[PDB]
Design a protein around this ligand. Structure first.
Ligand SMILES: CNC(=O)c1c(-c2ccc(F)cc2)oc2cc(N(Cc3ccc(B(O)O)c(F)c3)S(C)(=O)=O)c(C3CC3)cc12
Length: 562
């Protein structure tokens, strides 16, 4: 069937949509080529709609069915609980899209009468009605990028599809515990969201070293969400039901599957009927879990069909990497083509054909790659990095305009060991926070899809836990990485690293003078900026942190707040 059918009604905005990066002195201090920086808007929705709309032909085989059997068996070891209304309410972000039924996120979080009443009614309806499709809103995401005029110019807006706030709370009640436990149980070490960045590096390096002659590749499915079929989604439901569940949970999960997950009508912001969906909803609780599971099942089966030897897989939603034992250059190339053929049969062809890689650093996944630097003693330290263009562009926008979620803070946390995060992002934002008297204020940012409230002053212990102490002492970065950052700075009109160093010395001094947590920030985060270095010992606060739930699971599009 068609992933989508359209009525011709447009995807419409809620509020004003700024297309171009606004001119602001503080944002300009980071990046000056403002004309290159743009936000996606509803204006490009039509372009995206075209790409995501196609017929799915799915043909399953014995390998698929074998893997599915394994998965169901693994799932049967899981015990999952219902969340109470109150518990589910507290997982709702304060900035979450308000209900159409006279209440919003703040009302949900405060357990307000109107909100709780509607939520209760929605739950009752789920128990009583297992068939009637549930309404969804379609919106164009507003995301910031840098133009690549050589490479097709501006990206079209991604489409987000989500049900009412009331339904979203009920999803949590029925499935939060399931989507938090199941992927790990089924996938084990292949579940990508269980790892901190530091742990991820360790896993990848070990996997690579575990092969006599390693070969690895990334597999990029074209429009993964659209490739997800009705049968795929019903299979996901079947897997959920393998868990030991509460009777009411079983009913709600089935109802949510048949009425929401498998498909339903699309309504724009003006209340108009846009069409009908028969694939994955991008904005439901199960998006991450579902995508990861379905990608895993298909990929694991495809590995068998492709005759790949001693496969180690890593899966993050639709993002997939396989590391295996090389059979030879031509043999490997042929096996990869076979892998693609199998994935294609399963409904998931690639955007660009995958390529075998024999150097770990040459594999890119989730926009990131493994690179090498050196610690204070000259020991080689591996870390994850990425092209800084998008992070910097977004950082500039978020400086110029107040945003509910601060991507810059997340990038600093996740990419803390990188040359660019340390010298540019840290320097810039601490200078901005000082200037605006916002140093002590907690900010909202996303980590693996889940929204967290994080205080900037807690960055050093957070970074230590995620990356290790070495993150504050890395030097002698690779020529390739240095060159990539340099190229980015030239492109975007960002000041050179030596200028940032000078700025960092001033920022560091200011931070040290304030004492306490600020002083620890100055000491640890900006030790790179000074010749006369301070002794960076383990941070006491780091041990006192409880961060377990940071890397339990992925929640992208799942409307989760911790
Ligand atoms: C299967 N692919 C992988 O698991 C990952 C590889 C990888 C790279 C090269 C290779 F050879 C093998 C694997 O790099 C990664 C880096 C990230 N990060 C950044 C990040 C990227 C995207 C999102 B998001 O939009 O979902 C996000 F939330 C954070 S990080 C530094 O760890 O925090 C992640 C996070 C969990 C999603 C996964 C991988």
């Amino acid at each position: 069937s068609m992933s989508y059918s359209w009525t011709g009604a447009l995807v419409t905005p809620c509020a004003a949509e700024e297309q171009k990066l606004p001119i602001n002195a503080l944002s300009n201090s980071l990046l000056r080529h403002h004309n290159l920086v743009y936000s996606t808007t509803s204006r490009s929705a039509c372009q995206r709609q075209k790409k995501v709309t196609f017929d799915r032909l799915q043909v399953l085989d014995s390998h698929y069915q074998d893997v599915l059997k394994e998965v169901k068996a693994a799932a049967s070891k899981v015990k999952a609980n219902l969340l109470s209304v109150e518990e589910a309410c507290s997982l709702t972000p304060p900035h979450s899209a308000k209900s159409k039924y006279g209440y919003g996120a703040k009302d949900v979080r405060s357990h307000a009468s109107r909100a709780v009443a509607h939520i209760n009614s929605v739950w009752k309806d789920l128990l009583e009605d297992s068939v009637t499709p549930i309404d969804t809103t379609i919106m164009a995401k507003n995301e910031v990028f840098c133009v690549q005029p050589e490479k097709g110019g501006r990206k079209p807006a991604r489409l987000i599809v989500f049900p009412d706030l009331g339904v979203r709370v009920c999803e949590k009640m029925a499935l939060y515990d399931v989507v938090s436990k199941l992927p790990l149980a089924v996938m084990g070490s292949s579940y990508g969201f269980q790892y901190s960045p530091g742990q991820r590096v360790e896993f990848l390096v070990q996997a690579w070293k575990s092969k006599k002659t390693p070969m690895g590749f990334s597999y990029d499915t074209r429009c993964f969400d659209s490739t997800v079929t009705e049968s795929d989604i019903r299979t996901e439901e079947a897997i959920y039901q393998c868990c030991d569940l509460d009777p009411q949970a079983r009913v709600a999960i089935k109802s949510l599957t048949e009425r929401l997950y498998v498909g339903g009508p699309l309504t724009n912001s003006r209340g108009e009927n846009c069409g009908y969906r028969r694939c994955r909803a991008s904005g439901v609780l199960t998006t991450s879990c579902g995508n990861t599971l379905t990608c895993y099942i298909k990929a694991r089966a495809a590995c068998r069909a492709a005759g790949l030897q001693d496969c180690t897989m890593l899966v993050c939603g639709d993002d997939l990497v396989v590391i295996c034992e090389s059979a030879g250059v031509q043999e490997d190339a042929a096996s990869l083509r076979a892998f693609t053929e199998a994935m294609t049969r399963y409904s998931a062809p690639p955007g660009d054909p995958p390529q075998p890689e024999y150097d770990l650093e040459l594999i890119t996944s989730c926009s990131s790659n493994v690179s090498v630097a050196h610690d204070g003693a000259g020991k080689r330290v591996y870390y994850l990095t990425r092209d800084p263009t998008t992070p910097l562009a977004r950082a500039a926008w978020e400086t110029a305009r107040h945003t509910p979620v601060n991507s810059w803070l997340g990038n600093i946390i996740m990419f803390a060991p990188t040359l660019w995060a340390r010298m540019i992002l840290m320097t810039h934002f601490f200078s901005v926070l000082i200037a605006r008297d916002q140093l002590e204020q907690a900010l909202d940012c996303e980590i693996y899809g889940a929204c967290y409230s994080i205080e900037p002053l807690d960055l050093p212990p957070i970074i230590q836990r995620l990356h290790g102490l070495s993150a504050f002492s890395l030097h002698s970065y690779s020529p390739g990485e240095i060159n990539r950052v340099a190229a980015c700075l030239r492109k975007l009109g960002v000041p050179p690293l030596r200028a940032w160093r000078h700025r960092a010395r001033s920022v560091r001094a200011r931070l040290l003078s304030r004492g306490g947590r600020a002083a620890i920030c100055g000491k640890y985060l900006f030790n790179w900026a000074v010749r006369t270095k301070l002794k960076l010992t383990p941070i006491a606060a780091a041990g006192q942190l409880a961060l377990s739930g940071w890397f339990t699971a992925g929640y992208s599009g799942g409307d989760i707040y911790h």
